Amino acid sequence: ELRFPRFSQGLAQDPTTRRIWFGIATAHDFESHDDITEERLYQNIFASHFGQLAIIFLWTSGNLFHVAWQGNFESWIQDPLHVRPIAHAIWDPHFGQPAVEAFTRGGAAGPVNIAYSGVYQWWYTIGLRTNEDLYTGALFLLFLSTL
Amino acid sequence: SLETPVTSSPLVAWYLSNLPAYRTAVSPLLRGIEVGLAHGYLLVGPFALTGPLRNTPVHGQAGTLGAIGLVSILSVCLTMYGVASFNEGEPSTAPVLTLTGRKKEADKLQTAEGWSQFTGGFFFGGVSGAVWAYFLLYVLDLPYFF
Amino acid sequence: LQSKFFNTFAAPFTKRGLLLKFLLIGGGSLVAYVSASASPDLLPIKKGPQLPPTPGPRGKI
């Protein structure tokens, strides 16, 4: 290939910039690549599915850990109808004092936004109660992603 | 091609030929450090005076450190462009013919190693120019307005 | 005269790959340190709101 991209020789001979562009759109594609066969295609499909699952698992692990480190679940139990949820702490070096003012809500020690993804009702319906539960779940999910 | 007084004149060609980016009679590293200190003295002004801490007695050091950071970023960009476009043993691509037609030695400034010397010189010169503008703006600072 | 000083006080800064390494690691370390050591007087973030906030509609939730 002698240069990017490594999957289509026809592109590599494009001194026009569109090379880079089509060096992105036609990467995941497998039929159009050069020197591709059936069983190779299937093994690639398998590796890609594993990667996708790794991504999903890391995503949900991050959800859990962030709630566990800055969320409100524990003290949200005591009144799920008068204490808004919390998503994650704000650290924005572009704010002014009134910004920091109008974001510290729901009973926190800094600017935080309200978690709207419904994850609290989910993790509360099954019956979880403490931040330690969330830590354990996050560790398990992270190890599963690595696996 | 068209040759207007702008693109073709004694004084304009003279000026453009005298600035360091074309005086091939000097080492490329020295031209690099010269342009670097030039831009270093250049950029400190607005960055400091109009920065987001201008109403604070720290605005000087703030603007100067920001200028230094921008200089570092651009030196990174220079080195990156050089390693991207310039190979390490291949010839030069500088104009080797002057206006009269004197076949010029391939400008060592337009070589991989030459571009590297240029980048290093520019970075060091930008740092020096920034700190010099600081020391001349916040110690010996009467005859200016800021 | 000035050429020797300009050469010697920026002599190790000539190798290009070394130059990328040094600039990148130095920039990272510097920004991390200055942000971790940011003083609250010049940054409205390094301190909290320090006032009692407003409750949302419908009581607090």
């Binding site: 002698l2 | 990156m80 | 990328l20 990148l24 920039g27 990272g28 920004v31 942000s35 390094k46």
Partner: peptide, 30 residues
């Protein structure tokens, strides 16, 4: 605290090194 260490890193220096690495890559010529 820890945000002040990490957010600036994943905002400026890590994206910078990623961008320059991919620049160097796509500009390769073997």
């Amino acid at each position: 605290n820890l945000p002040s260490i990490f957010v600036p890193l994943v905002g400026l220096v890590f994206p910078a090194i990623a961008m320059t690495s991919l620049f160097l890559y796509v500009q390769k010529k073997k």
